[PDB]
Amino acid sequence: RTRSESTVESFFARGACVAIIEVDNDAPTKRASKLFSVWKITYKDTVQLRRKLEFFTYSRFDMEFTFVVTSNYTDANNGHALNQVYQIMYIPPGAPIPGKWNDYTWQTSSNPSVFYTYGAPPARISVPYVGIANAYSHFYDGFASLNDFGSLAVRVVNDHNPTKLTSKIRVYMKPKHVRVWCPRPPRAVPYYGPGVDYK
């Protein structure tokens, strides 16, 4: 035992990309012009973090989210565009999910939001323990894998611009203050779905 770099905090608190969000600005032309996508915060999208968390039954940790936004000009000769401003809103568990770009959910009455300006250092937010139970449940035998975690929504708040722009937002989640309980053996078969089914 003993020695550093082998602790639970060292094992779990590592930054990794967990989601990619595609947003547009205006001028659909021939595309759907998706202004937002919305992503439910979960650890099932990354195999490494999923395998690390499945090693235990109950866990408690805080989530630190880092957003990196990279914009691209679809047409090289559309003209210089004004600097883009992106709105990243955290949706707490139990809150309504946005369905339209200009709906009431984007008013940030109770949903935390951060505005990111292109060229600025990447946005960073910290989400504390938002679970309903005393610890997150990776396994539930009965009638809890969906341990809330809220969701993230990113949209462009710029005005109507004739030019076409596409931006990609990389979401990095770094767990903090990780505590684990009830050790479990590692997964030995490839994952199929969000459950424990095997083939």
Binding site: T57, Y58, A135, F139, G142, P185, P186, V196, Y198
Partner: protein
């Protein structure tokens, strides 16, 4: 008190047995009545496994206490593993049976002992929870070694499972 489940028989082709708690005790007299009459509850378990094997019998049994034994509700009799109905070597969760020893466990080697005991503390994400729709603990008995015996007598070794609740708490009478 001590509640004894139905006796299972060990064969030479048995792939193992599994039980769920407090699912196995839902109809076990007073404890089952209390867990049915209350919306919330909390209680520990004491697991005793008895193998009625003679000195001429060969094999080993692996008793594992798995918290939240999710499988990819029979009740008293539980169920059996499948050779190829959870898979025995996959432990019902796609995990090699060698790593199943991470859980609290006891080894019943017929050449050393014929009984084993286990202490199961209350494990859950809540201080108190319903005793009916949630399975707090699971008991899995696996044939670590194939059953063999002298060519004299007997074909089936009876196996007795006794579970006694402890630290019982009940709230929300209905």
């Amino acid at each position: 008190r001590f509640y004894t489940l139905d006796t299972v028989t060990w064969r030479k082709e048995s792939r193992g047995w599994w039980w769920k708690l407090p699912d196995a005790l839902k109809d076990m007299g007073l404890f089952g009545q209390n867990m049915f009459y209350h919306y919330l509850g909390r209680a520990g378990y004491t697991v005793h496994v008895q193998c009625n094997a003679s000195k001429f019998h060969q094999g080993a049994l692996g008793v594992f206490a798995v918290p939240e034994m999710c499988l990819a509700n029979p009740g008293e009799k539980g169920g059996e593993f499948k050779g190829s109905c959870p898979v025995d070597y996959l432990f019902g969760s796609g995990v090699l049976a060698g790593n199943a020893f991470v859980y609290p466990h006891q080894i019943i080697n017929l050449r050393t002992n014929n009984c084993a005991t286990l202490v199961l503390p209350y494990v859950n994400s809540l201080s108190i929870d319903s005793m009916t729709k949630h399975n707090n603990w699971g008991i899995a008995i696996l044939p670590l070694a194939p059953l063999d015996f002298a060519t004299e007598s007997s074909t089936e070794i009876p196996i007795t499972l006794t579970i006694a609740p402890m630290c019982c708490e009940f709230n929300g009478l209905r």
